[PDB]
Amino acid sequence: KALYDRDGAAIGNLQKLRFFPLAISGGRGARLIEENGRELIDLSGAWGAASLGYGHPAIVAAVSAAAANPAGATILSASNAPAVTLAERLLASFPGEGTHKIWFGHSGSDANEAAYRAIVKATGRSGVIAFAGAYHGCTVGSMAFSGLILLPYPDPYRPYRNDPTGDAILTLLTEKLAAVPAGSIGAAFIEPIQSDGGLIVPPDGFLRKFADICRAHGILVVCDEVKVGLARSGRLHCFEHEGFVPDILVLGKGLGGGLPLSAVIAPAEILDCASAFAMQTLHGNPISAAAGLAVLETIDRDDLPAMAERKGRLLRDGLSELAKRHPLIGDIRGRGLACGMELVCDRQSREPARAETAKLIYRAYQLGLVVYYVGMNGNVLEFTPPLTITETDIHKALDLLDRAFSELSAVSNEEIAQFAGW
Amino acid sequence: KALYDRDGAAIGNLQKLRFFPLAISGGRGARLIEENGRELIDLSGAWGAASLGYGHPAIVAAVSAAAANPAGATILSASNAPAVTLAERLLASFPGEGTHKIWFGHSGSDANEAAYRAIVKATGRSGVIAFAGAYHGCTVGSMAFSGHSVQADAAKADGLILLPYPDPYRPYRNDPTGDAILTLLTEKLAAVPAGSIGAAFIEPIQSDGGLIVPPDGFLRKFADICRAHGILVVCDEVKVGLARSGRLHCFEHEGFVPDILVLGKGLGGGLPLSAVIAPAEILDCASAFAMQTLHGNPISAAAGLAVLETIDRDDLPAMAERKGRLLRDGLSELAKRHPLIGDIRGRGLACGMELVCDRQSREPARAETAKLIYRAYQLGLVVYYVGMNGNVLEFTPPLTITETDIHKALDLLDRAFSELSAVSNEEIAQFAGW
Ligand SMILES: *Cc1c(COP(=O)(O)O)cnc(C)c1O
Numbered sequence: 044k045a046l047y048d049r050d051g052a053a054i055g056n057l058q059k060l061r062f063f064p065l066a067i068s069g070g071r072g073a074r075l076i077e078e079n080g081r082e083l084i085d086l087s088g089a090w091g092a093a094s095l096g097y098g099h100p101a102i103v104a105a106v107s108a109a110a111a112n113p114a115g116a117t118i119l120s121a122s123n124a125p126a127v128t129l130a131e132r133l134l135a136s137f138p139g140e141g142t143h144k145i146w147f148g149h150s151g152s153d154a155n156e157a158a159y160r161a162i163v164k165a166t167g168r169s170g171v172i173a174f175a176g177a178y179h180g181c182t183v184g185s186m187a188f189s190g191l192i193l194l195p196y197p198d199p200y201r202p203y204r205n206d207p208t209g210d211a212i213l214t215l216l217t218e219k220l221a222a223v224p225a226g227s228i229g230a231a232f233i234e235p236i237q238s239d240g241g242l243i244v245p246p247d248g249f250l251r252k253f254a255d256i257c258r259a260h261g262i263l264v265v266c267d268e269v270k271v272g273l274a275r276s277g278r279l280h281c282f283e284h285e286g287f288v289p290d291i292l293v294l295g296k297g298l299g300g301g302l303p304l305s306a307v308i309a310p311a312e313i314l315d316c317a318s319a320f321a322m323q324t325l326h327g328n329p330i331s332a333a334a335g336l337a338v339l340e341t342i343d344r345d346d347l348p349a350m351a352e353r354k355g356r357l358l359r360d361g362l363s364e365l366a367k368r369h370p371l372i373g374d375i376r377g378r379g380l381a382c383g384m385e386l387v388c389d390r391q392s393r394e395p396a397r398a399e400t401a402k403l404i405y406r407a408y409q410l411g412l413v414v415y416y417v418g419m420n421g422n423v424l425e426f427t428p429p430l431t432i433t434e435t436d437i438h439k440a441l442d443l444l445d446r447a448f449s450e451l452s453a454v455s456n457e458e459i460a461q462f463a464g465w
Numbered sequence: 466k467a468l469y470d471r472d473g474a475a476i477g478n479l480q481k482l483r484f485f486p487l488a489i490s491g492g493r494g495a496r497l498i499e500e501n502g503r504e505l506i507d508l509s510g511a512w513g514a515a516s517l518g519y520g521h522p523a524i525v526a527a528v529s530a531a532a533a534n535p536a537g538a539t540i541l542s543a544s545n546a547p548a549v550t551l552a553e554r555l556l557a558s559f560p561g562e563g564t565h566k567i568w569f570g571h572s573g574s575d576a577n578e579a580a581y582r583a584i585v586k587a588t589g590r591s592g593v594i595a596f597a598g599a600y601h602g603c604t605v606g607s608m609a610f611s612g613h614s615v616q617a618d619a620a621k622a623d624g625l626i627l628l629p630y631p632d633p634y635r636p637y638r639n640d641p642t643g644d645a646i647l648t649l650l651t652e653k654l655a656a657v658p659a660g661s662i663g664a665a666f667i668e669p670i671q672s673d674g675g676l677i678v679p680p681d682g683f684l685r686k687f688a689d690i691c692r693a694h695g696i697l698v699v700c701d702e703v704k705v706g707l708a709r710s711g712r713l714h715c716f717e718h719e720g721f722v723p724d725i726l727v728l729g730k731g732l733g734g735g736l737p738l739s740a741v742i743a744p745a746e747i748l749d750c751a752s753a754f755a756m757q758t759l760h761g762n763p764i765s766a767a768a769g770l771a772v773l774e775t776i777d778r779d780d781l782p783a784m785a786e787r788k789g790r791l792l793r794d795g796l797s798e799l800a801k802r803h804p805l806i807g808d809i810r811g812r813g814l815a816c817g818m819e820l821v822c823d824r825q826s827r828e829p830a831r832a833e834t835a836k837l838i839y840r841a842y843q844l845g846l847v848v849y850y851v852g853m854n855g856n857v858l859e860f861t862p863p864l865t866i867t868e869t870d871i872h873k874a875l876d877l878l879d880r881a882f883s884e885l886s887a888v889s890n891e892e893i894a895q896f897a898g899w
């Protein structure tokens with residue numbers, strides 16, 4: 044039986060996000076090795092989780108050593124040195140000396156859930172501001188508000204109310220705040236680059252101004268950097284690009300370099316408001332913790348933010364070259380190695396090319412390239428490879444992507460129909 | 466400055482369940498190693514997550530090889546070999562009626578939530594039966610049908626029905642047979658529209674409720690009432706599953722097979738991993754529905770496999786049954802000496818010891834229990850308490866715990882009983898506990 048056929052038989056549809064029959068048995072650096080023998084360049088990096096790539100020496104060393112001599116298995120019922128070392132390391136990376144503490148999780152979902160629960164418990168303020176198209180996780184607790192003030196994301200490519208500046212969204216926020224009692228909203232949840240929305244970098248200056256308004260109202264600013272955080276944006280934290288510092292930082296995916304690990308950096312008052320309150324047995328386990336430590340160590344050691352900045356420009360330069368040749372490309376956006384490329388039927392009408400996008404990723408897979416699409420309209424290719432990816436791998440991936448566009452016709456809508464996707 | 470103070474400075478209280486200042490920098494077998502190098506026998510096994518203990522060679526080999534050559538990092542947008550192999554291995558070991566599939570998670574919390582969300586999605590029946598005192602998780606979705614104190618302050622599912630647990634030591638309405646509970650169930654089902662309940666969540670030994678083994682034959686009768694009303698039976702074996710009970714699956718003791726099995730804790734051997742074994746119709750009813758990026762990651766999956774292969778190779782069910790008798794015998798020996806010990810219960814290496822002020826009226830001895838484990842810690846033995854009354858000592862050691870470890874543990878436990886008055890009220894007040 045083929046690996047992909049075994050998968051369909053053993054594993055239920057519930058957790059499947061499948062677009063093509065990718066069936067993996069290995070990985071080395073930025074390359075996935077399929078069962079069938081072929082290597083593929085990973086432009087996805089498991090949605091950004093594989094920050095250091097596959098089999099990075101630092102991850103192997105840290106994880107192997109931890110497995111061999113684990114400081115227990117939890118942070119709930121015992122303090123453990125790896126988790127404490129990682130916590131101090133995270134506090135050191137954030138402007139929160141004496142003011143902030145750490146909460147460890149398994150995922151961005153449980154981390155966002157925990158932040159919200161803790162905010163409500165600590166402040167009694169259960170009202171929330173979030174953006175339409177926001178992704179804060181896929182559990183009841185994180186979809187709770189992923190009471191609610193929904194704002195449009197300030198998208199330069201598709202302005203709200205005919206205002207490219209985004210200032211009409213700040214005016215909307217002002218009205219929504221005045222419409223409801225002061226002290227009713229406890230938190231604003233932001234993505235400093237929108238993920239599921241289609242890798243949208245907000246217009247310049249918007250978020251600084253957004254945060255200002257929140258602070259004026261005693262509203263906590265929660266920055267969700269599960270996707271775009273830890274070196275990936277060309278700086279360590281994505282908010283560094285934006286002229287503000289959040290009250291709360293949520294971290295996940297790439298934090299674990301392949302292991303389940305998330306963290307909330309939050310004021311001490313928020314995280315000390317109760318004990319035994321948001322906890323799961325393997326939270327703060329020393330094997331995930333040691334993996335996270337290796338990720339942060341490598342980020343500093345190998346200057347991964349500068350690597351991401353340098354390699355992102357190269358990638359996005361590459362994409363612009365393809366745009367001269369392929370009219371489908373309408374917008375190329377991003378910071379560092381978090382890039383999006385939106386595909387449109389007309390560049391002036393900006394009408395989304397959904398069908399063509401689906402064929403494009405399927406085709407790219409046949410050619411030896413792993414890339415997925417996101418967006419409200421299913422028309423934005425997401426690029427989040429290992430920060431470790433080689434300049435050679437980028438150029439190869441660019442050729443394959445070029446090839447994919449030239450060969451969309453080679454993919455039928457019935458090959459697309461076999462994979463349920465989103 | 467020392468590790469425990471550094472922890473208070475860096476890590477919030479929100480996720481802390483602390484009973485004493487245990488500060489760990491290492492582990493070997495059934496032993497935890499503190500910052501200064503002092504060794505402690507771990508009878509908790511991290512609430513049973515450390516199924517194979519610490520630094521077990523099979524976990525080390527599995528994890529190191531998977532880190533070196535990982536099959537991606539996900540089962541969401543890719544199939545990977547470690548996860549499928551693990552899925553089929555779990556499937557092979559389940560004596561299911563019909564055909565079943567696997568959902569993979571990080572924890573028993575996300576697994577219970579996902580099981581429930583899938584049932585509601587597959588069937589449209591949102592009503593749920595769970596037991597008073599039930600612990601199914603600490604996420605919004607899994608707290609919705611839980612009954613423990615941790616979940617006491619959370620939003621409960623509409624159509625949640627809570628039944629008393631069949632506790633031999635504290636029988637509901639003083640009926641030792643458990644008949645009054647099945648009678649209560651019957652009255653509950655008919656105060657509610659026919660076909661409205663989709664699920665019944667069962668702990669085959671109730672964990673946080675006080676490590677409670679139900680009356681013999683009760684769960685089979687309970688399962689029968691559910692099956693006759695179209696209600697799917699969900700067996701939460703996160704705590705008490707995979708060899709720990711003296712059998713591979715704890716339901717093997719109760720003479721019924723569940724529709725859905727939930728796994729976690731010990732499944733990962735120290736890495737985050739859970740699983741749901743559910744009928745195909747339930748797990749296939751939707752796609753991209755209940756998902757987190759690192760679900761089915763190949764490193765957690767490799768450990769899961771090392772756990773099941775070790776369970777098989779070392780016949781860990783048979784080991785647990787014997788080591789468990791050895792442990793409960795030793796505890797019975799302690800009962801003959803210390804009047805606080807009111808009840809000793811459990812299967813295999815899942816054991817509970819309830820402490821009471823008086824053996825006749827069985828009033829819970831809360832203050833002594835806290836002092837007991839604090840003293841045990843000082844003597845070099847790690848053990849926690851559970852229960853609605855905070856009076857139940859829980860023993861869930863690594864399944865690979867040696868006989869000598871157990872004897873050493875029994876001696877330190879004996880000593881901790883003799884010496885609990887050494888522990889001051891002020892010392893305990895420093896730890897928030899439950
Ligand atoms: C992936 C992601 C999450 C959720 O993380 P999981 O690990 O999938 O639960 C939350 N927020 C953002 C911005 C993400 O990208």
Ligand SMILES: *Cc1c(COP(=O)(O)O)cnc(C)c1O
Nearest residue numbers: 323324572573574600601703704
């Ligand atoms: C521990 C436990 C859970 C929850 O598992 P986490 O790892 O804490 O999410 C659920 N049910 C039972 C019976 C448990 O023991």
